[PDB]
Structure 1
Amino acid sequence: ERVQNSNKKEWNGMMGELLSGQADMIVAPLTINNERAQYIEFSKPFKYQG
């Protein structure tokens, strides 16, 4: 989400903590896209989904 009056798009949620360094590794319903793979390194998919 874009931070208001700063033109900066900032993640929230789990990625508001992990990309800020406030958290360690995450297990989650990790829906995988291009951008999350761009900022978070990923393991191989544990549970194939749709």
Structure 2
Amino acid sequence: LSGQADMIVAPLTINNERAQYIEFSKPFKYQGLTILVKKEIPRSTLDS
């Protein structure tokens, strides 16, 4: 909503708060949002 602009090609999630001023096209990738968690080496190796 500015000057040069004229298109946007990037990950831009579809949402209600952004669909009034502008409009999008048919989605080219369906993707939700998940949880990413850290990992550690298991201690149940019977080392002792």
Shorter-normalised TM-score: what interval? 0.5 to 0.7
What is the TM-score when the length of structure 2 is the normalising length?
0.55
CA-based RMSD:
1.2
Aligned residues: 32
Unaligned runs of 5+ in 1: 1-18
Greater percentage in helix: 1
Q: Which runs of structure 1 show a deviation greater than 4 angstroms over 4 or more consecutive aligned residues?
A: none
Q: Which has the higher contact order (CA 8 A, sep 6+)?
A: 2
Unaligned runs of 5+ in 2: 33-48
Greater percentage in strand: 2
